[PDB]
Design a protein around this ligand. Sequence first.
Ligand SMILES: Fc1cc(F)c2c(c1)C=CCO2
Ligand SMILES: Fc1cc(F)c2c(c1)C=CCO2
Length: 182
Amino acid sequence: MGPGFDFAQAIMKKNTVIARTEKGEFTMLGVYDRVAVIPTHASVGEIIYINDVETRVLDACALRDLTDTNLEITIVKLDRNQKFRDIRHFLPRCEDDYNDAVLSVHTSKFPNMYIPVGQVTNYGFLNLGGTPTHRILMYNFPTRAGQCGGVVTTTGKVIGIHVGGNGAQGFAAMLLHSYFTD
Ligand SMILES: Fc1cc(F)c2c(c1)C=CCO2
Ligand SMILES: Fc1cc(F)c2c(c1)C=CCO2
């Protein structure tokens, strides 16, 4: 439904998996090799289910900024037998605002879901579920339970992962290229 829905669909088909923790199912974005991202409130353990396959977690790191503030992103290395397509070239280098974004979700209960959210604001600080959080993007769509881990894109950029909402607005944690230098 535009170059943006074409790009969102390409990212969902090749670079997402369904991740299940004790906290439910999440859209999980694969970034390169066996490295993926998920919201930190998924509470990733030693074992995770990936497309309903029991998978060992080789490493999991909840990112914080250099002020020691939550970013709500956990980077996970999976003991999976297959690598992701490398999409690090689609990650922005800096904090920014965006036009005409799409939020895309794929879980067992929420498959094949694409949401045009429009304008994305570099919001910055959010008290997210009582936790001070930085590098938040905001869009004016009444997102619900189900969309956590959803991927926010524009044409040719993967810009964030959905982490919350207040009934009127939705919030995503930024993805930056510098998080995934090996
Ligand atoms: F069949 C479709 C569906 C869309 F959403 C499109 C197009 C064609 C082409 C461009 C943007 O929007
Ligand atoms: F495109 C989708 C995919 C879904 F799974 C959905 C929706 C849209 C909407 C409601 C329930 O679940």
